[PDB]
């Protein structure tokens, strides 16, 4: 019948609305009301009370769960035309279930049934009888000829407008009332309002009023906090602006909204605070886009046309054909008009023609925004632990309420009013803010992080960051700042009597300087700027060349030079080549890694291999330069056929000034830090030894000989020792290899060992991985996760975006300056991004890792202390209320209100705290149920109940109460009320002061004054009340004057209970707080 085919949906059934008569909360209750009215025409009023309660609960139940709603309100049907609602069962990894409405409208004489789920359109395909999301031509089966033969949309495009929709983000911000209406129905708020209604029924007016006002204030604050974020998500959408669109074989200006797939557009220089409308593929022309917003890189790429590729044979691969794609949201710096004529007339503006591919939420940035908004997963997805913890307290509640009921029946009290006290106790045991504690902790931590420019895309990853066991770094862009300092040319001396002989500048032969000036990818814009790789800019400034607006680069003091044609640079077969021209003749230069350049030129120098390894061993990074004279548009293998050596480029990459200290702190903080990079092993080992990852000597695993025989050779950085190894036959020796050298593994040795039995034993002792392909990083992270070690990878992001999402927590360290961000913030205030990794840091410093780890640790430990404090306060309050209600006494209004205020004063201050700068070796354990929490809670509760029972025995000894007939609980001054109230108010503060978090994680209690002074003031008030130091206070609060002997017992008992609780909590914390670190985070070498 009816179905939905999409990766989001799992199952679906149609619905139809049911009349109000047949609803489950209207008809079945009228017979019960009639029976109650007949029986009525004391003990019967509780029956009407519970009947109204059950009715309102049945009426509120459909809003809590969606399946209950679908079963109550609607009845399932299997006819697609008649149904006016539909239910969607989501895939367990995408959002949650929901009910969505089916809409109908007639177009072109035929009705089209469509709805919208998670801002993802659907339609009704008559032949398949199944709702299906609209499918774009690019994804399923692209053909490169189809994009060329297209001539844009023509005619009346109403069906396309219905199928694809408007090309804009659609996030509606609801009004405050609409959001508060939903927040009110929530189970927590309903339970809290019911708890307040009970206190109203028990003749507590001011207490209930204050509590209700506080609840309403908290809900209003939460709604404002949600609305501000919903408004923040709106600014990511681009502002509509005019572009030219090809329709009806003529250029007409349409806004950004009225865009559809397979529509021709003309892109020009992007304006201020604007971006590219939607995902496009170039059809003709060129552009220099700036991917800083989507990719998070500074170097602006160079995009080329697709017209040159043949149309019939080739397919649109989105691989080698990635230079033609323009992602949405990026800015275009310079665009060039089409050179030759085509079937379509040239655009009125000098912009480049391009084809739209994806519109709306289905582009990359749109998909990311949708995933962030709807399919986001909240913290503590399981949520079973909080409910189990609440059931524990409810068991204790029932144990106390049974005794309350038995004693109330024994002392002659009325049962009709005693059931109300039983319900009060049971409902006062349960804390409402218990399950929603981790969310508030994570939100506070996210705010404190965003104060440090460390913005967070996915919040639930924060508790993962608290206890991380292995953190993986990257060499370039992360541990090395990209400000290269040119050192000097080398290897140009044919004699070369000295290996390390360097020519600074203005001394090499003209060939070397011509080559280093010709082969580069820089370009000057029409406005006038220099854009490119900063290493090339630094090199070009050091040698003294100058690039003009035209590709010609001259004025270097040696002549005039121009670039005729250039070749792209790729990771595979890595090198850059270009063909230039000099006033005498024409030549061709090439610049690439030395290992690949050596196998190209004919005349091999004698000191090549020696000098390359010598300069690579100590920090420096080398590049080779070669040229060939070319006599007078051709392929790439002819220009690079044979070459002539011209020298080396020696770049000394300096470390970030903040790397050594952060790595030292991470090493001494019970974390293991390993390096994963793509550079050659010598430079990687040198950087790892200078930073502090490897201490002693190091070994390098690599191929033995040029033959692909898969034989790995252990070899030191120098030629001092060489150990032969065989992956098929031999095996790793622990004492001979792992105990002494802390080896480093090359990607080739990791590939050849794929399938060995001791791979998982090898991956425990290595700290440095070099020459790993972007695919093997995912394998390494997956293996580290499989062994049971949580991972934290911090890299630049643009090179390996898929690897960051694999680790438990990933960070992308962008490039920026503190003064730049300060000026930007000042400009934004006067006026009033990576988006690819989970966590982003706008600043280039490395301390973001330490910052996020510390914040996660603090969030975890704050959650723990809030659990303990809430549970203990609830139990204490419950048992104090029980001890009171056993007899006829009860609190008044002023006493309970003052108790509430004096506890809220401490609740305010206890959230504040400043984390210690240095991390600690003790990692906090996650989970509610463990020896520490349960032991501490139960034993502190034992001490508190011992104190309470002793003082109650003493008070009953002082004044005896006799069983009276038909007692009614009423407030009158008596010794029992005084004693129990002072004990309650002192013991809650005692728990607040004992269960505060220790120094090692965040801070000591004494350091912060906001809590110290509050606790001292409340304890001073309580001690002046207990000792009768100010008779005006006792008289004003209705406290009976106590005997001289009883005050001593009260004061000493409280002062001893505090010490007992402190001692027990300190013992449990000293013995069961920190979990043991793993076997990999140890420090030892021989």
Curated annotation (Swiss-Prot):
Topological relation to the membrane, as annotated: Multi-pass membrane protein
Cited Pfam families: 2TM_P5A-ATPase, Cation_ATPase, E1-E2_ATPase
Keywords assigned by UniProt, alphabetized: ATP-binding, Endoplasmic reticulum, Magnesium, Membrane, Metal-binding, Nucleotide-binding, Phosphoprotein, Protein transport, Translocase, Transmembrane, Transmembrane helix, Transport
Source species, domain of life: Eukaryota
Molecular function (Gene Ontology), one example: phosphatidylinositol-4-phosphate binding
Annotated EC: 7.4.2.-
UniProt GO cellular component terms: cis-Golgi network; endoplasmic reticulum; endoplasmic reticulum membrane; mitochondrion
Transmembrane spans: 25-40, 44-63, 176-203, 205-233, 383-412, 415-429, 433-451, 847-886, 893-910, 931-959, 975-996, 1009-1026, 1044-1072
Renumbered residue ranges of the record's region N-domain: 484-654
Reaction equations catalysed: [protein]-with a C-terminal TM segment(out) + ATP + H2O = [protein]-with a C-terminal TM segment(in) + ADP + phosphate + H(+)
NCBIfam families tied to this protein: ATPase_P-type, P-ATPase-V
Function text: Endoplasmic reticulum translocase required to remove mitochondrial transmembrane proteins mistargeted to the endoplasmic reticulum. Acts as a dislocase that mediates the ATP-dependent extraction of mislocalized mitochondrial transmembrane proteins from the endoplasmic reticulum membrane. Specifically binds mitochondrial tail-anchored transmembrane proteins: has an atypically large substrate-binding pocket that recognizes and binds moderately hydrophobic transmembranes with short hydrophilic lumenal domains.
Family as reported in the entry's similarity comment: Belongs to the cation transport ATPase (P-type) (TC 3.A.3) family. Type V subfamily.
Any further remark recorded for this protein: Present with 1870 molecules/cell in log phase SD medium.
Domains: entry comment: Contains a large substrate-binding pocket that recognizes alpha-helical transmembranes, which alternately faces the endoplasmic reticulum lumen and cytosol, while remaining accessible to the lipid bilayer through a lateral opening. The translocase alternates between two conformations: inward-open (E1) and outward-open (E2) states. Undergoes a series of conformational changes with ATP-binding, phosphorylation of the Asp active site and subsequent dephosphorylation in a Post-Albers cycle (i.e., E1 -> E1-ATP -> E1P-ADP -> E1P -> E2P -> E2-Pi -> E1).
Name the UniProt record assigns to this protein: Endoplasmic reticulum transmembrane helix translocase
Provenance organism: Saccharomyces cerevisiae (strain ATCC 204508 / S288c)
Gene of this entry: SPF1
